[PDB]
Automatic annotation (TrEMBL), chains A, B:
Mg(2+) 1 binds at E100, D101. It is found in: Cytoplasm. This is Hypoxanthine phosphoribosyltransferase. Ca(2+) 1 binds at D6. GO terms for cellular component: cytosol. It comes from Caldanaerobacter subterraneus subsp. tengcongensis (strain DSM 15242 / JCM 11007 / NBRC 100824 / MB4) (Thermoanaerobacter tengcongensis). PANTHER family: HYPOXANTHINE PHOSPHORIBOSYLTRANSFERASE, HYPOXANTHINE-GUANINE PHOSPHORIBOSYLTRANSFERASE. The keyword Calcium applies.
Amino acid sequence: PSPMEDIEEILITEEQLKAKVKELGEMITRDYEGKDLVLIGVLKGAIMFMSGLSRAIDLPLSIDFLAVSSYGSSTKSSGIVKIIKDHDIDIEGKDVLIVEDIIDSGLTLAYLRETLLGRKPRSLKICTILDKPERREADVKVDYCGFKIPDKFVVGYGLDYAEKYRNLPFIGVLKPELY
Amino acid sequence: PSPMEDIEEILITEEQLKAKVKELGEMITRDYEGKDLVLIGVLKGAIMFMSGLSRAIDLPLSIDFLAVSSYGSSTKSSGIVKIIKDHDIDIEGKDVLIVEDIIDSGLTLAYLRETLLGRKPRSLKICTILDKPERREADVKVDYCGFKIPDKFVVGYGLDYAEKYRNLPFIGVLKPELY
Amino acid sequence: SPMEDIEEILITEEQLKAKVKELGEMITRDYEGKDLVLIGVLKGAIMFMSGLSRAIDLPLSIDFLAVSSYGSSTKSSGIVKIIKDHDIDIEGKDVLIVEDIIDSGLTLAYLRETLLGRKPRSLKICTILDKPERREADVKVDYCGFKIPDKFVVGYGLDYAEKYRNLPFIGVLKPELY
Amino acid sequence: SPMEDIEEILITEEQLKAKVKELGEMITRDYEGKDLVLIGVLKGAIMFMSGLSRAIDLPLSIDFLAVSSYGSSTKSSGIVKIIKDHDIDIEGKDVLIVEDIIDSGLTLAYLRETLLGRKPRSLKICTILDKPERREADVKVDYCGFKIPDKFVVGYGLDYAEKYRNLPFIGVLKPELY
Ligand SMILES: [Mg+2]
Ligand SMILES: [Mg+2]
Ligand SMILES: [Mg+2]
Ligand SMILES: [Mg+2]
C-alpha cells in the first residue's frame, strides 16, 4: 500500500522490468567486451535504471553523472540546458553510453549528445528503459531501448512527480486526480 | 568472470547483501510511517545502496544527492569539504536520512551532518550499509547500519577503486597486486 | 541610454572611488601581517570587489560564492543553496566577506555561520552600501561604505533584471520600470 | 609589499585605464542597438570585466563561467569541465567573451564552440592582454588590449598561486618565486 495506492494502472510490472534490464545488460556486455565503457546518466531520473543496468553488465565499467537545468524557454524549443554538475571522468577516447530513464521529445538529449561529442569520446551510444515514439521532436538514434509506451503520465523506477514515486519497483500511471 | 576475477575475497555475498537492504528497508518504513522522509546520498558511492534501499521502503519518499570535494588537507583533519552539487529539495521541517555507502573515520560525515542541520530539518538520521568501527575518528551516531567489517581494501555495490568495481553485486577485497 | 532610466543620482562615481580608497586604507592597516582572503557573492559584489582589492596594499587572495534560493527557507531564515563554493581553503585564514549591499542581512547571517564552520582564523563583513532600516538579522558589519534610504538603487554592481550593473554611480530607478 | 616581488612594470595603471576606456568606446559604437551580454571566465577576467563594463555606455548584462581541467584533454585540445555555467539565456543575443589573457587559445576555442551551440546571434572575443607567439589554436580575437612578450606577468586579475591579482598594473614576477 501507500504509494501503490495512488497508482491507477501498471504499464510495466516489476518482474517485466527486471527481465528487460537483464536482457539489455547481456547485449551491452557483448557489444562492449574489450572497450573502455563509461556510463553517464542524467540525475536524478536515471539512478534507478543505472543501478540495475550496471549490475547486469559483467564488464569493467565506469559510472558518472550529469545534472542539468533549464534556461527557461530555450530549453523547450532547442533542448539547450545549463550544466549544474558536469561529469568528472575524462571521456576523450572512451566508449560512452548515455543512460536515460525516458526519451520523449528528445530535444535535451540531442543537445547533450552534441555537447558530449565535443569532448571526443571514441564512441557515443544511447540507452533508455522507456521511450515514447509519439513524442519524438528531434532526430536521435536510440541504440538500446527497453519498452515503447503510450503518452500517459507515468512514474516509478526513477521517474517522478513532485519528487515522488521514484522508488516504485514498477512503471505505473498516476490517477489524473493527483495532477 | 572479468571484474570478479580481480576479487581476492568476498566479505558480503550478493544474497547476504540483498537480505540486509530489505531488512533495513522494513525498519525505516516503520519508523517513518507518517513523516516527510527525504533520502540524501553522497555521489557517487551511495547510488547502489540508495537505489536498493528506497525500493525496500514502502513509503512516499523523496531522493536527492550531494556531490562534494576536498579542500586538500583540511578535509583530512576536519572533514571539511567543498560543495560541488548542493541538494535541490528544501529540507527545512523535513525528516532527512543520510544514506552512505561506508563510514570509516566519519570526519566528512560529521561535517555534512552539521551543515545539513543548519538548514533546519525536522530530524536528521544516518544510514550506512558498510561500517568500519576501527576507523572512527569522529563522534557520529549511525542510526541504521548494515555490516561491521575489518579495515581491508573493499569494493563493490557502489564502492570503487579508480572508478571501477562499483557495479559488483557483492562486497569483495581487491588483490593487493592491483593497488 | 542606460542612464536615462534614473530618477536621481545618490552617490557619484567620485564618491564611490573615494570611499573605496578609504576602506582599502583601513583594511590595509588592520590586516597588515595577516593571511587575508576576500570572498564576494556573485554577481553583485563584482565592481566593489575589484575596486576594493586594488585599494588594499596587501598580499591577498580572492574567491567567490554563487548562491541560490530554496524558496521558503531562503525568505524566512535566509537559507540558500550553493551553486559555486569557494575554492581556496579558508582554514586558519582571515576572511573578509565582500558584499554589494546589506539590507535584511538574512542570507548574509547564514553564509557567515556557514563559513565559520570551516574554521577561519577570523571572519568579518564589508559592504559598500547599507540599508539599516531594513535589517531582519542580527548581523555585524565591520566595514561599511554608505548608509542609504530604502530606495530602489542600481549601479556599481546592483542590478534590475540584470541591467544597470555597469553604471559608475548609484542611482534610483524610475518607478515606471517596476 | 606585494609590489616588491616585481622585476619590472610592463603596463602602468594609467595605460590600462586608458586602453579600457578605448575598448569601451569601440564596443559602445559596435553594439549600439544590440542585445549585449558580457561573459568572463573566473577569476582572472574580474578586474578587466569590471572596468570594461563601466566604459561601455550601453544596456548590457553580465554573467560568468567557472571552468576546470580534465587533465590530458584540457592540455591537448583545451577541453574543460564546467563548474559554473552562465545563468543568462544567450540565445539570439550578442555575446562577448571577456578574458584576462589569451596565449595558447585552446580552452578559449573550446568555450567559443561550446557557446555557439547555444545559438547566440553573434559571438566575439575580448582580451586585455595577448601573447601572439604562444598561440596553439586558430582563435580570432575581435577586441584586443595589449600585445606582450612571453613573460611571467601578474596584476590586474592575473595571479600566481592566487596572489598578485590586486595590483593595478601589469608587472613581471621575479624568477626567485617560481
Ligand atoms: Mg532524463
Ligand atoms: Mg560516502
Ligand atoms: Mg549581495
Ligand atoms: Mg582566463
